[PDB]
Amino acid sequence: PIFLNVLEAIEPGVVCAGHDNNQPDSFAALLSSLNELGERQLVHVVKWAKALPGFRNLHVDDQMAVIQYSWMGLMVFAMGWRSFTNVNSRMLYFAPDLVFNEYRMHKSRMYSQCVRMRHLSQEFGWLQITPQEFLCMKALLLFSIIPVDGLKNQKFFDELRMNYIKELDRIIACKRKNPTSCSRRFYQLTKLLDSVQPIARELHQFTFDLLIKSHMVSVDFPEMMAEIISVQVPKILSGKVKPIYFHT
Ligand SMILES: N#Cc1ccc(N2C(=O)[C@@H]3[C@H](O)CCN3C2=O)c2ccccc12
């Protein structure tokens, strides 16, 4: 109960975008709001991550890198859950003041990615994902993308990741488990976790392209964002840093 206790305890609260729901759904205004929300979420993900059990075990530089690389996916996963819980996956609940309907999914020019995120969101329902399974999975997501040539202290990372996999196994396996149930459950969740990496890559590519042409579409990028997108995101896109997949 100690592990789960801290996961619930450190879970971020409601984060609003500050979007003007009175202005028209322009690509510019929507994306400017997603960016600002992205920044706000980054702030919370950093304080959240740093308060995770064993996170301080990681070397100093590995700490921020692991957060910056996995940030997009962490936002994807949590947002999918928010969508499931609040609107039954009908729309994408980015924030209480920024809910995407089909019109907004289209106006943002991110329809394809939105569509995939809505699918992931639906998976929480189909799979009957537990609020506890969700928390553990989100935590594991933090340690799911690293430089192909390793970190400053890979050994500490590997141990940290190993322990979080075990916690998941512990949660998704405390009841009479065996056959199509114990491993059935684990396979389902690991497959679900892998499914977030392709969404994050698509989002990374899209965000990168948008930053590059930002002054041409009147889309505003916050400081921390422009930096992460221009410094860490290209490493993922060029293959230097890659997701850790369970399958295939
Ligand atoms: N909660 C929240 C939240 C906030 C911003 C984004 N998000 C980004 O960081 C990037 C840039 O804004 C352009 C495309 N994009 C996004 O949609 C999210 C993506 C997926 C899930 C949640 C997101």
Q: How far apart are CA 248 and CA 233, in angstroms?
A: 23
Q: How far apart are CA 99 and CA 131, in angstroms?
A: 21
Q: How far apart are CA 64 and CA 78, in angstroms?
A: 19
Our mutation pick for probing the ligand 1 site, out of 37, 98, 218, 227, counting the most ligand atoms within 8 A of Cβ, is 37
Residue 38 CA to ligand 1 centre (angstroms): 5
Between the two ends of the chain, the Cα-to-Cα distance in Å is 33
CA distances in angstroms from 213 to 105, 120, 218, 220, 232, listed in the order given: 20, 29, 9, 11, 18
Closest protein CA for atom 3 of ligand 1: 38
Which residue numbers belong to the known binding site for 17beta-hydroxy-5alpha-androstan-3-one? 35, 82, 207
Our mutation pick for probing the ligand 1 site, out of 16, 27, 34, 205, counting the most ligand atoms within 8 A of Cβ, is 34
82 Cα nearest atom in ligand 1? 1
Ligand 1: does its nearest atom lie under 6 Å from the Cβ of 203? Answer: yes
Which residue is it, tokens 């948008």? Answer: 210
Q: How far apart are CA 81 and CA 89, in angstroms?
A: 8
Which SS3 state, helix, strand or coil, does residue 145 take? strand
Q: How far apart are CA 194 and CA 215, in angstroms?
A: 34
Is there a contact between 71 and 228 (Cβ–Cβ < 8 Å)?
A: yes
Ligand 1: does its nearest atom lie under 6 Å from the Cβ of 76? Answer: yes
Largest CA distance in the chain: 58
Ligand 1: does its nearest atom lie under 6 Å from the Cβ of 121? Answer: no
Q: How far apart are CA 110 and CA 93, in angstroms?
A: 15
Q: How far apart are CA 83 and CA 61, in angstroms?
A: 33
What is the CATH topology of the domain spanning 1-248?
Retinoid X Receptor (1.10.565)
Show the CA angle centred on residue 200, arms to residues 182 and 55, nearest 5°.
65
Residue-by-residue DSSP string for 43-106: HHHHHHHHTSTTGGGS-HHHHHHHHHHHHHHHHHHHHHHHHHHHHTTSSEEEETTEEE-HHHHH
Q: Which of 152, 33, 148, 166 is nearest to 97 (CA)?
A: 33
Q: How far apart are CA 68 and CA 142, in angstroms?
A: 9
Is there a contact between 124 and 87 (Cβ–Cβ < 8 Å)?
A: no
Residue 34 CA to ligand 1 centre (angstroms): 5
Q: How far apart are CA 236 and CA 239, in angstroms?
A: 5
Per residue, what are the HEC states of 149-201? Answer: CCCCCHHHHHHHHHHHHHHHHHHCCCCCCCCCCHHHHHHHHHHHHHCCHHHHH
Q: Sign of the CA dihedral 197, 131, 71, 100? A: positive
CA distances in angstroms from 75 to 62, 152, 215, listed in the order given: 20, 25, 25
Closest protein CA for atom 20 of ligand 1: 76
The encoded tokens of residue 184 equal: 């059935």
Spans of all domains in the chain: 1-248
The structure's method of determination equals X-ray
* 1-33 per-residue burial string, b: 16 or more CB within 10 A, e: under 16: eebeeebeebeeeebebebeeeeeeebebbbbb
Which SS3 state, helix, strand or coil, does residue 112 take? helix
Give the amino acid at 248: T
Is there a contact between 242 and 146 (Cβ–Cβ < 8 Å)?
A: yes
Closest protein CA for atom 23 of ligand 1: 75
